[PDB]
Design a protein around this ligand. Sequence first.
Ligand SMILES: [Mg+2]
Ligand SMILES: [Mg+2]
Lengths: 92, 92
Amino acid sequence: GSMRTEKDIENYLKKKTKGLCLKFTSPGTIGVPDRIVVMNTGTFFVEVKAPGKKPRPSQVAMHKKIKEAGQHVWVVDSYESVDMALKEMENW
Amino acid sequence: GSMRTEKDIENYLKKKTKGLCLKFTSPGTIGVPDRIVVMNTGTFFVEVKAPGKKPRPSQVAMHKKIKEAGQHVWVVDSYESVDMALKEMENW
Ligand SMILES: [Mg+2]
Ligand SMILES: [Mg+2]
């Protein structure tokens, strides 16, 4: 019925980001994170999931490539987790 | 005839990046940089131009938004400028 969805979480991330929260598409590459947050401390990758939903294996594989190149990826699935992710970025 | 083009410069950037060099598209937003370089020191924006060509005003306006949010944007238009940009990122 009225449980929050992935799109709700994504809209909340956009609202709370102090900086830019740009949609990220990368033609030809599978599984890239939904958003790139641009703020004073860095540009950060964020994948948004519906409450309780894990990234698919193709998404995890892409996150691993990002981590191997040396950067982190946040996965958010609730307003609380959005708040925590943004706070961590603000303290990076 | 055989002068390097924007695509040549972009291919060279991809070849020389120590990390990921992901195509960046952001549906609904005009003028975003061509590529996001992911390496140990950060995730960085790069716009690629043909030799001697300046970013269009809509691209400059987007770069300004990125800079106001607190991050830099590199503009590369030659193999030399690619080398210099990547070296600066490796030293970030
Ligand atoms: Mg998602
Ligand atoms: Mg270009």
